[PDB]
Amino acid sequence: NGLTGTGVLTESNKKFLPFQQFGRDIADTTDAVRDPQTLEILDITPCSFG
Amino acid sequence: ICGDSTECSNLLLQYGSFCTQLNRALTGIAVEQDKNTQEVFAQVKQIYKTPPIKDFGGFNFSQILPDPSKPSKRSPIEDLLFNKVKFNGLTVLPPLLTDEMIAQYTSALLAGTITSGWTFGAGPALQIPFPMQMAYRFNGIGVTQNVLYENQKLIANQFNSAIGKIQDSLSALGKLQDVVNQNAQALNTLVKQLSSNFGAISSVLNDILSRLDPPEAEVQIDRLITGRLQSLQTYVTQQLIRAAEIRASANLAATKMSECVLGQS
Amino acid sequence: SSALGKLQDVVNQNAQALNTLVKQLSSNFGAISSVLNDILSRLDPPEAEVQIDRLITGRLQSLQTYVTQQLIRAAEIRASANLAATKMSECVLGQSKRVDFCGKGYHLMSFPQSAPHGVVFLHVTYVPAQEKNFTTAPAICHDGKAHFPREGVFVSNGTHWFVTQRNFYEPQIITTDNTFVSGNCDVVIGIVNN
Amino acid sequence: FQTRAGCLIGAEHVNNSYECDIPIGAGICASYQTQSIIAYTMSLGAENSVAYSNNSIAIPTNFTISVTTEILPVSMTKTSVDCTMY
Ligand SMILES: *[C@@H]1O[C@H](CO)[C@@H](O[C@@H]2O[C@H](CO)[C@@H](O)[C@H](O)[C@H]2NC(C)=O)[C@H](O)[C@H]1NC(C)=O
Ligand SMILES: *[C@@H]1O[C@H](CO)[C@@H](O[C@@H]2O[C@H](CO)[C@@H](O)[C@H](O)[C@H]2NC(C)=O)[C@H](O)[C@H]1NC(C)=O
Ligand SMILES: *[C@@H]1O[C@H](CO)[C@@H](O[C@@H]2O[C@H](CO)[C@@H](O)[C@H](O)[C@H]2NC(C)=O)[C@H](O)[C@H]1NC(C)=O
Ligand SMILES: *[C@@H]1O[C@H](CO)[C@@H](O[C@@H]2O[C@H](CO)[C@@H](O)[C@H](O)[C@H]2NC(C)=O)[C@H](O)[C@H]1NC(C)=O
Ligand SMILES: *[C@@H]1O[C@H](CO)[C@@H](O[C@@H]2O[C@H](CO)[C@@H](O)[C@H](O)[C@H]2NC(C)=O)[C@H](O)[C@H]1NC(C)=O
Ligand SMILES: *[C@@H]1O[C@H](CO)[C@@H](O[C@@H]2O[C@H](CO)[C@@H](O)[C@H](O)[C@H]2NC(C)=O)[C@H](O)[C@H]1NC(C)=O
Ligand SMILES: *[C@@H]1O[C@H](CO)[C@@H](O)[C@H](O)[C@H]1NC(C)=O
Ligand SMILES: *[C@@H]1O[C@H](CO)[C@@H](O)[C@H](O)[C@H]1NC(C)=O
Numbered sequence: 140n141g142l143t144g145t146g147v148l149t150e151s152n153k154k155f156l157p158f159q160q161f162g163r164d165i166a167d168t169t170d171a172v173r174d175p176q177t178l179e180i181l182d183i184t185p186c187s188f189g
Numbered sequence: 190i191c192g193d194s195t196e197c198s199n200l201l202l203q204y205g206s207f208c209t210q211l212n213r214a215l216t217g218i219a220v221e222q223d224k225n226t227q228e229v230f231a232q233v234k235q236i237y238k239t240p241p242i243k244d245f246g247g248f249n250f251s252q253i254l255p256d257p258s259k260p261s262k263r264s265p266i267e268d269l270l271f272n273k274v275k276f277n278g279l280t281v282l283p284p285l286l287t288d289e290m291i292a293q294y295t296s297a298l299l300a301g302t303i304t305s306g307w308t309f310g311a312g313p314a315l316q317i318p319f320p321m322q323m324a325y326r327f328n329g330i331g332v333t334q335n336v337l338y339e340n341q342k343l344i345a346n347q348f349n350s351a352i353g354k355i356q357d358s359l360s361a362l363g364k365l366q367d368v369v370n371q372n373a374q375a376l377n378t379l380v381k382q383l384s385s386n387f388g389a390i391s392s393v394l395n396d397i398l399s400r401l402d403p404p405e406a407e408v409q410i411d412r413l414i415t416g417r418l419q420s421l422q423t424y425v426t427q428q429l430i431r432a433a434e435i436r437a438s439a440n441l442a443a444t445k446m447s448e449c450v451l452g453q454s
Numbered sequence: 455s456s457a458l459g460k461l462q463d464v465v466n467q468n469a470q471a472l473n474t475l476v477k478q479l480s481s482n483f484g485a486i487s488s489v490l491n492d493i494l495s496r497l498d499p500p501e502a503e504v505q506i507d508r509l510i511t512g513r514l515q516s517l518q519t520y521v522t523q524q525l526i527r528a529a530e531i532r533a534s535a536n537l538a539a540t541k542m543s544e545c546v547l548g549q550s551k552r553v554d555f556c557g558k559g560y561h562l563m564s565f566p567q568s569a570p571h572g573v574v575f576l577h578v579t580y581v582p583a584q585e586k587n588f589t590t591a592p593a594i595c596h597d598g599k600a601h602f603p604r605e606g607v608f609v610s611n612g613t614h615w616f617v618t619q620r621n622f623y624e625p626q627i628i629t630t631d632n633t634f635v636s637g638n639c640d641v642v643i644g645i646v647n648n
Numbered sequence: 649f650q651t652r653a654g655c656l657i658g659a660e661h662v663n664n665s666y667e668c669d670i671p672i673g674a675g676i677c678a679s680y681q682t683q684s685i686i687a688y689t690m691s692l693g694a695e696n697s698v699a700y701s702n703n704s705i706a707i708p709t710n711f712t713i714s715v716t717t718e719i720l721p722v723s724m725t726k727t728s729v730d731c732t733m734y
Contacts, residue, residue, distance in 0.1 A: 184275075185275050
């Protein structure tokens with residue numbers, strides 16, 4: 140719903156507050172989201188590179 | 190700079206070899222960090238071992254000899270010292286020497302000194318009893334060598350108490366800490382500089398790109414490119430200035446290891 | 455005749471930078487061409503200012519990057535020359551006692567030779583060889599007194615006791631000319647009777 | 649072959665240990681010896697065992713005169729630019 144990105148999505152085990160959509164890291168990069176339809180938290184890890 | 194997008198890569202291709210220079214600059218720094226460590230620690234031909242006894246004239250080196258009941262085989266004081274100190278294109282390479290290897294170089298330097306004095310630093314290691322080596326060293330500071338043999342027990346007790354006080358004074362390392370930090374904080378600024386527009390509409394290369402058409406978007410993408418390239422040049426220039434300061438320090442360490450550990454100054 | 459990589463390295467780094475400086479005179483930096491005779495031929499003066507400024511900014515950036523990296527490379531050549539000046543003083547016009555400063559071994563003497571942008575030192579050192587073991591004592595007890603060597607070590611070939619100098623084996627009879635006395639022979643640990 | 653520094657393809661891993669030739673990382677080097685390319689853990693150096701005792705000494709009976717070289721850069725090339733002409 141607006142957050143555009145790339146990466147691997149994985150089942151999370153963090154708990155947002157029930158009005159927060161996505162989570163950010165220190166240095167300010169999106170690293171978790173909440174699925175609008177089912178309302179579950181998913182981590183966003185980058186696509187392997189090197 | 191670009192980061193995934195493709196409208197950015199063709200525009201950045203117009204700047205020449207600015208990115209090749211920066212990668213060369215950073216690679217030179219990384220190759221210098223292994224030579225720093227080779228010059229300080231790999232100052233010994235053989236890997237020397239202490240004998241299974243510890244009859245050293247009443248001198249007790251147990252807190253600085255390696256600990257056989259460990260995977261790392263560090264000493265007690267080296268264990269005290271080690272408990273006190275993916276992104277947008279960023280990567281950390283590992284050092285060539287593990288610190289098991291570094292601890293193995295240091296223990297061999299130690300066993301060379303305790304068993305042969307200063308002879309292993311000038312050629313083949315020639316054993317000498319530790320009390321007699323201590324008496325040679327008392328001559329080097331201008332004291333007559335019976336002052337050592339008539340006071341051996343007192344001198345050994347004073348050494349042992351002074352070695353005991355060092356752990357208490359340990360369990361300081363702000364220099365190394367300073368180093369470590371100065372680098373993490375400069376790497377955090379480079380990542381934080383990616384959320385700035387530099388005078389474009391936004392700072393995210395898609396929203397600029399899916400809300401304007403090419404002629405209009407290329408103008409903003411060039412501003413983003415200019416800002417992000419300036420940030421990277423600032424970063425690399427400061428890493429170059431900070432590595433020359435670390436090299437002057439490793440050079441002082443190499444001279445100390447030669448002149449204070451492999452000889453008497 | 456059959457190793458000068460430091461000198462080579464220096465002589466090279468500079469050429470690689472000077473070539474990168476010239477190879478930047480053929481980038482657009484976001485302009486219609488890289489030639490001023492092409493922006494001054496298919497653009498009117500009000501439109502060629504905007505295209506000339508894009509080249510000016512890029513070329514200034516590239517020249518200033520060249521000048522920063524030369525300052526940083528010269529500060530490193532300066533420290534090397536400062537070390538060479540100290541080695542010429544301490545290894546060529548003297549004999550050094552510092553360990554591993556004028557070669558590996560015991561420094562005897564040094565000779566300088568000039569090189570393209572530097573200097574070669576030839577270090578002549580002494581290295582001991584072909585060691586034997588003997589047995590030692592710290593002192594000798596005799597007439598109730600303890601004797602210590604004036605400038606050597608007491609050694610034993612199995613049955614007899616001599617004095618040598620510490621770096622070269624040359625045994626001598628223990629006399630009152632190469633030893634001195636201090637104390638009685640019950641406080642030193644390891645005294646032998648002789 | 650998996651390394652602490654990444655995945656290596658086209659070299660075989662041996663169990664010997666030599667002096668480092670081409671540095672891979674985390675203690676691993678490569679060489680063209682056994683041919684092909686191999687991996688392993690570098691060697692710190694030989695192994696010397698001093699026969700230390702509470703009444704033993706070793707004394708040299710001979711010597712060698714050795715001479716070695718040391719190379720140092722003192723200068724680099726003096727260049728000038730003319731900003732306006734560049
Ligand atoms: C929106 O509708 C979908 C279905 O259209 C809901 O999904 C259901 O979620 C519950 C979880 O509590 C599941 O047990 C159901 O099986 C789901 N249904 C389907 C068809 O998958 C979703 O929960 C709705 N949104 C909200 C906020 O409730
Ligand atoms: C060398 O010194 C250490 C002290 O740092 C000695 O180890 C301690 O010895 C005391 C008694 O003398 C014990 O109470 C401690 O528990 C010991 N600490 C240990 C073992 O970690 C050690 O014995 C000394 N070496 C010799 C040969 O006496
Ligand atoms: C000095 O004496 C020692 C004691 O024997 C010699 O060291 C031993 O040498 C033998 C044969 O080389 C080895 O097998 C032992 O492992 C050595 N260490 C011991 C016994 O602790 C040494 O060779 C002698 N040095 C010289 C120069 O003759
Ligand atoms: C230790 O050295 C002494 C040398 O003073 C040896 O004793 C002499 O040996 C020569 C030749 O064998 C004899 O002619 C002398 O009579 C010996 N005595 C003296 C007082 O000179 C002795 O053999 C050596 N010991 C060992 C184990 O090599
Ligand atoms: C070194 O010489 C002294 C004096 O010749 C020895 O001292 C004598 O030792 C014997 C045996 O222990 C005693 O019976 C005498 O009373 C001692 N005399 C004196 C004046 O102390 C000494 O033992 C010798 N050391 C060795 C290792 O043989
Ligand atoms: C000390 O070492 C030298 C070698 O550096 C020995 O001299 C050599 O002796 C062998 C055999 O006699 C000759 O083949 C060589 O030509 C000699 N070398 C030189 C440079 O002349 C010398 O004999 C040794 N001295 C002792 C006492 O062992
Ligand atoms: C040396 O150690 C031996 C044990 O083998 C002991 O008998 C002797 O008293 C010791 N001597 C000295 C001088 O430490
Ligand atoms: C190397 O030695 C280990 C010993 O644990 C052995 O298991 C392994 O098979 C050896 N590797 C090769 C290639 O022989």
